Write a protein that binds this ligand. Sequence first.
Ligand SMILES: Nc1ncnc2c1ncn2[C@@H]1O[C@H](COP(=O)(O)OP(=O)(O)OP(=O)(O)O)[C@@H](O)[C@H]1O
Ligand SMILES: Nc1ncnc2c1ncn2[C@@H]1O[C@H](COP(=O)(O)OP(=O)(O)O)[C@@H](O)[C@H]1O
Lengths: 51, 51, 510, 73, 71, 309, 466, 160
Amino acid sequence: QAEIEAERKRAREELRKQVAILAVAGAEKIIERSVDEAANSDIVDKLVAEL
Amino acid sequence: QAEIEAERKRAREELRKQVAILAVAGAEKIIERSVDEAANSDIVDKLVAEL
Amino acid sequence: QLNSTEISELIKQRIAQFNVVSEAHNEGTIVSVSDGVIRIHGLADAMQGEMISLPGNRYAIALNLERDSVGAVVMGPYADLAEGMKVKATGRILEVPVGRGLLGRVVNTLGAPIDGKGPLDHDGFSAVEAIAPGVIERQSVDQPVQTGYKAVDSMIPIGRGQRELIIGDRQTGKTALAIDAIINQRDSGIKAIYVAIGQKASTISNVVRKLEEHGALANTIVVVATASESAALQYLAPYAGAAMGEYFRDRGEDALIIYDDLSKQAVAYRQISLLLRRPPGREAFPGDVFYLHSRLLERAARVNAEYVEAFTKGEVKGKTGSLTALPIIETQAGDVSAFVPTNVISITDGQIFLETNLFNAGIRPAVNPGISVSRVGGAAQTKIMKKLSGGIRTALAQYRELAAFSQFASDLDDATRNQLDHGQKVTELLKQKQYAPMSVAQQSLVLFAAERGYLADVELSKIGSFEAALLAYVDRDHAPLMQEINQTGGYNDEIEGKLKGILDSFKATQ
Amino acid sequence: VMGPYADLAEGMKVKATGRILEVPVGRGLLGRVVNTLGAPIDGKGPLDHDGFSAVEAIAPGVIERQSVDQPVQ
Amino acid sequence: NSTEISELIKQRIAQFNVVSEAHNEGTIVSVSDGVIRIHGLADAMQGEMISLPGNRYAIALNLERDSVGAV
Amino acid sequence: HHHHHGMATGKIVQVIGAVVDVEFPQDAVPRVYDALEVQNGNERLVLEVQQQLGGGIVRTIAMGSSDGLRRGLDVKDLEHPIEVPVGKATLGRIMNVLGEPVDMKGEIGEEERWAIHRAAPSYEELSNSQELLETGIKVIDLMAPFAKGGKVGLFGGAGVGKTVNMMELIRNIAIEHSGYSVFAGVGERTREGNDFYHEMTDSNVIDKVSLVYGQMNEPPGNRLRVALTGLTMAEKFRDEGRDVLLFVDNIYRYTLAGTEVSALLGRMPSAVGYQPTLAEEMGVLQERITSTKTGSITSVQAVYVPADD
Amino acid sequence: HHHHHGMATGKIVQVIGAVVDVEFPQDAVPRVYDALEVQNGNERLVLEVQQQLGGGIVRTIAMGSSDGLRRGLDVKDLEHPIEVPVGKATLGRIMNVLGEPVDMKGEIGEEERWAIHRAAPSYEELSNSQELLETGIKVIDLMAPFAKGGKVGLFGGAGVGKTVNMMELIRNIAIEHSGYSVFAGVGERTREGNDFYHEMTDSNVIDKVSLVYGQMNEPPGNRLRVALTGLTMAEKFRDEGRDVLLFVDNIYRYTLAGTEVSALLGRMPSAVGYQPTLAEEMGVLQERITSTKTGSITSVQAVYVPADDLTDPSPATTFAHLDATVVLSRQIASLGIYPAVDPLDSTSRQLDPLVVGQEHYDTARGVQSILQRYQELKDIIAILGMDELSEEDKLVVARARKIQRFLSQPFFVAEVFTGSPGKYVSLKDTIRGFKGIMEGEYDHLPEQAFYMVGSIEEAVEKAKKL
Amino acid sequence: EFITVARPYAKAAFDFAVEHQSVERWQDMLAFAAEVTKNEQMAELLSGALAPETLAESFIAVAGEQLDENGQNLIRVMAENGRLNALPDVLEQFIHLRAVSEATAEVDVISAAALSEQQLAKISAAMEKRLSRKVKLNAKIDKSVMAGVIIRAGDMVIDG
Ligand SMILES: Nc1ncnc2c1ncn2[C@@H]1O[C@H](COP(=O)(O)OP(=O)(O)OP(=O)(O)O)[C@@H](O)[C@H]1O
Ligand SMILES: Nc1ncnc2c1ncn2[C@@H]1O[C@H](COP(=O)(O)OP(=O)(O)O)[C@@H](O)[C@H]1O
């Protein structure tokens, strides 16, 4: 039983990590808005500067 | 073994509460990372409005 | 909740920021593949044998660079995608998690991941390819190991690193075997893995079930290998797992591993050869075996100290490295030559064979009595084990040889009868039940049984068993002190006496 | 090859028959002597079958069948 | 394939125009273990011995189109 | 396979019989498992895996018939392969390999459509419990136990009236449980089949289970293909979280079909001319059966016993 | 040694495995074996020659590790197509296949160098002599004569004790020296190797000889090369000493590598996937063996018999090229007999009765007859059991199990395997055995006694107790 | 598309081209040729015939006489080769051939490929980079570098 409890820590933690990863996806979609927001050719010009 | 088990399921459920709850904290963090990651320009105004 | 911290950490790793390179780099477009192998373009100059990143992060196995283009062999899903894509490629071929820190954990064989915890710690990538350790630097090793099978231990002693043949036979308990013997090592003092070729879910599962059942499964680990597993993973895998032991072995520590059913690897690798389109040999065979085997077989060692000082980079300042491991040999239809098994046998330092009859006869032990042996021998046999234990090795054949008698009329009297009975009974005695760990103490009891025969003729078969159980028991009450002896290496004439008085002393028993 | 291959030679242009495998089907011609390619082997000059029938064939649904108790001599 | 010269192609590049030179002795392009792809000695006699560096003479049975070799 | 509009043409490149050389657009092509259909005179025709070849042309095959070829040829490419409309209605209803309601058509409406190509592994997925199947067999079961979702070998034969055994299973499934399974014959004397249909009427229980049958009148591409079908179909019921076991046909028929494929593949056969990878196929097969955490898949099979070698 | 300056390069043409596909200048030209250098990132590597391919591109070979190489790579070359230092200083320390001192001792060795190619004596050149050798070999020394300079053949795959029976070879070899000789082993196991090294130390015999020893897991290119190591190795000695002796290993591996590479060359295999020139290679290797008027040499040789297929054309070239040879019975082995050789099998061309006198030839013939007989009826029994045994026959049979059982004796050095020691043997005593056995002289003699047993006197002492 | 087969042919090319110094001229010949090859109604006819002479003649015949004697004897090589069917590939090779000597081109970064003749990697390259001033054009660049950095990024998310 104790071991099982450990496993539960592992799996629960894992689901948390999944919610974390899916969470990461949605974060990335919002990041698509972070591109949709505050996007300037100037920023590109900064990339150009990275030359 | 069963006895341990029930409480286990419980720990799961309360965890689920702390989960939906933490969804706030997550939305926060994700936003933050979206700025830091953008590594470009900081605009906090837009509201992604994501669960 | 708690993991929110973890999110923070990940934000810190994530703070590693970024850079870019290789706007063209090597790349090129993989022209056409059947089943992992592709007409493939780009990336001309790579270090031979490099691993090549792919969709779903897959390295590629490309043995052949033509003057013009090349071709490669995938691991993982074959059908994933359409052809002609640009090429992604790993810096280092043969890069796999290193350090021993993580342990006793279920991984993909190939991949790190498996149930339930993927998260693990790896000191760095590793590569299966290796060069032979200096033969000059080798430690002949007296470390005995412990069968936990009653007479089996007797049959052969165990030093670390010997090429260890088991036979194996279908339905034989071979999948069973004794592989349990890790329990015999409750205190391991070395880590082992085991390997299971194309193995069955239910099997792996049950092993799992039992896995902590005996207790700590973490103590050592093994790698996941399934039927679906591709000769990338499959033909390639046992080879893959090798470099692991370079943790302890390269930490200069002995370590053990079991693998068998390697035959799978052969037609596995042969289906490979159909790709090679090269002509195979008998049984679809190339000689890669040797290379393969040499690659494979060459692994185990025990080594010189200063050798380790090197191997330690002087860190461990020459701590004698060792390596242990176990093989086993399938019997399809119990045929001696068995071609390859001939070949392997040739390689082998030692031999185990099974006797179909016994377990077929139901006999709890089935091992083939002198049909097979360890050429290494009893160098580590306790001067008690060593000293007292000889006669069986030969005499067994005798009874068997004597078994040869074909049951003629009463003759030779005790020469015949006594020997044979003594043998047969002795066998019943020898029989060890499944899932029964042997005791070093038991060895004593064992060796004691006939040191002489203080009991030899005393009882009948049933009475032999019964009386025997009685024996083992009466002693505990009888003596504690054996612990020291048990702790001790033994073979003291004085001990022999104390044993002698204690020895007839059981007459009080029944 | 069909028939007396040996005679022929190449660059012969080409002669195309849409049909394939068609041999006169019918009950008309019964009992006659027939070469492989044709009935013609009969001394009989003509032969009457309803019309050309083709070699490719499709078996009927196993479902539809007659169990048969017809003994045979 | 058998052509393979490329350098004599340079030769043959325009020399496809003009050849008309039959040596008794042509160069032996490449060899394996006494047998050599070779070209020259334009005239052929089946199973003719063929002198060599050193006394040795060789022979080839197979009439081989456009080039031949022997051991 | 496609969510289908267009799906284009190609041309028919080189054709010997089932060998399908044909070419699609230069841009792209669907997976070998993925597949495409072309109306040839009377009907559309879809050919099996192309394997990899050039110019949009690659190598393909079909169980159907090849007559009436045309050099230039055009096939509308199906995309998401093998989607197939099973439904629970199938039990007691019979279709062709295509799901074509082969028999007197039960007309067989179906809301499920899925590729049979679906993998069915998952690590740790199935239950760890190891339940036995309880047959109520006075000797078979009593004399010997039965494990839930377990594979089962068959010895017996003609004159065994194995169908008697089967019917026993019929009363056994319903009677024992709600769970209901179906098996399908392939590569087999037809009369047996129809007689078994009648025998189903006599049995009358046929409703619970139904199958297309191979009968060996057919081309291999079909045949070898059939397995994935049943795979998906029961995959309804074990997917239903229901649990079951189906009988199985002569394997040697099946694997051997493997070789005929490999010669067809032009590939070097395995030794003794097996399918050079035939083991792999077995991987498919044996690998398929499982008692899921939520479902149980058992089965029995009788393979053509070859000389008892 | 001398630069070896510049020379530019072939660029690496194509990656075929270890097969070397690379392309050099038009003028750049080798021999069928010639000296090429190239530094890997790590180190200079070399690929031995190509046969002949065009475009400055030819193939080539390597003892090294192919992986981790970049294409088009420039490649260096050495003048001396092959250069093998020939010293007599060598007997101290072993060396790499490169001859790099395999012992920890660095060795200046010697400047004189050699190359793979070597050649045979004239028709008249060698010497032919009958001098022979006899030893504790229960039979074979008895069962067969051994002339001086003779190359002894080993039969069998291993597991036969081929390493442990080979270990007997060590023993008797070890047993008698009275000269200078050297043998080595390659593609072979270390536990043995390091053991022979430690025990060699203990022996401290190494002064007399050193031998580079090749390893089982070693790369092929070396393995192939090892023969040249042999020949050159001899060449110094044969020049140097008139006389020599040695032993030979894993020549199965020889075949094995060789075939292995054949199609790799883009060649079609000889039959059973052998290599097409394999025989030519063999006439090469055995041909490498020689003993001359100026000097003669002895050695004994072993190739793993693949699988006891006697039809093995490998085994064909064996007997064909065979000089001396021996055979072993996995029944006799399986009989649990420690010695375990196929006696009925093995034979001595040198055996001559005139040489042997009649008594030898005769008696041996007789035993042979017995064998013929027991073999002969062996059937009839197995069928019928013995119930019908003709008296005389029955008697012979007794003599039979007895005689087989009889051959076996202990060996002094043998106590390792079985704690039991043993002893050297005396031929005359054997001759006696011939009679008494022929007599069946001891009528009451115990069968069990005879096995692994001492002399008729000793077996008479047993006989007393046993 | 053996195309590797090109070299011995293709190679002698540059050399003849070197030696003949035609490469302007030879280049012309190649242009002309690939053109000729392209002809599809011709192409059907093109594998039609066995007699090599027939094709050398007919091909050379309708050709419009851009041909050279070295290219006549030599074209006769390719036909004698019989391999000639695939010839146009060599031009590609020939390009590289011509290119090989002194040439340079460019890979679009995220937009369009300058193909600038700049022989100093990362230098003459850099010269072009700086030379932007072509810095104007978007041409999908932003989606590309943002999405690609984003790709490394989500890549790290996976890594996270
Ligand atoms: N002599 C024996 N005593 C006790 N159990 C035995 C004996 N022989 C076999 N078994 C049992 O066989 C069972 C499973 O054996 P196993 O599954 O290994 O047969 P198998 O070895 O799988 O087939 P194979 O022998 O081909 O691997 C185990 O329970 C093991 O205990
Ligand atoms: N005279 C002998 N008596 C008993 N065993 C022997 C004898 N000769 C060889 N052997 C056995 O041969 C076994 C195999 O050792 P090894 O020589 O490697 O065999 P091989 O070389 O044939 O593989 C050894 O364990 C050894 O006991």
